[PDB]
Amino acid sequence: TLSILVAHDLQRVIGFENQLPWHLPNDLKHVKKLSTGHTLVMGRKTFESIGKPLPNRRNVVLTSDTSFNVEGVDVIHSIEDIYQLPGHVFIFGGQTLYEEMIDKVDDMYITVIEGKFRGDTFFPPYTFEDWEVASSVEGKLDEKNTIPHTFLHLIRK
């Protein structure tokens, strides 16, 4: 498959100053579970955010920098190289990847954070006319997980 994996808030904020606007361990665990043993594609900025590869999956970074060579990372330099990777590919971030990818992907694993954050980056506006709710599951709250959130899985109609 080719999937978006994203958390965005009630106004489609994904990002502030090159970080998540929220502490939400449960969603990062969601990320682990979904993506372990699989492939992530991310833009250069998001990779700098994470700061190195995530273990136990394939890590692929899209970048115009031809001198990019990072232990444990496969570089690519066009959107088109994505379509050639084997297996289940998660589009991992960030804003620009989602923009370039969102009409191309089979489905999306969105976490909706039921808050309003300050952001400087956003998820593309989308319509539920275009997208079927394969599943919607309320995130569980504790002290360590204190924002309401819902895990959507959408498939292109």
Ligand X SMILES: NC(=O)c1ccc[n+]([C@@H]2O[C@H](COP(=O)([O-])OP(=O)(O)OC[C@H]3O[C@@H](n4cnc5c(N)ncnc54)[C@H](OP(=O)(O)O)[C@@H]3O)[C@@H](O)[C@H]2O)c1
Ligand Y SMILES: COc1cc(Cc2cnc(N)nc2N)c2c(c1OC)O[C@@H](C1CC1)C=C2
Q: Which residues would be at the binding site for ligand Y (CB under 6 A)? A: 5-7, 19-20, 27-28, 31, 46, 49-50, 54, 92-93, 111
HEC states along the chain?
CEEEEEEEECCCEEEECCECCCCCHHHHHHHHHHHCCCEEEEEHHHHHHHCCCCCCCEEEEECCCCCCCCCCEEEECCHHHHHHCCCCEEEEECHHHHHHHCCCCCEEEEEEECCCCCCCEECCCCCCCCEEEEEEEECCCCCCCCCCEEEEEEEEC
Asked if 18 interacts with ligand X (CB under 6 A), we say: yes
Total interface residues for ligand X by CB under 6 A: 28
Per CB under 6 A, the segment of 10-18, 51-59, 131-139, 140-148 that binds ligand X is: 10-18
Q: Residue 152: name its binding partner from ligand X, ligand Y, none (Cβ under 5 to 8 Å by kind).
A: none
Q: Is 139 annotated as a binding residue?
A: no
Q: Residue 28: name its binding partner from ligand X, ligand Y, none (Cβ under 5 to 8 Å by kind).
A: ligand Y
**Residue ranges in contact with ligand X by CB under 6 A:** 6-8, 14-15, 18-20, 42-46, 49, 62-65, 77-79, 93-97, 100, 121
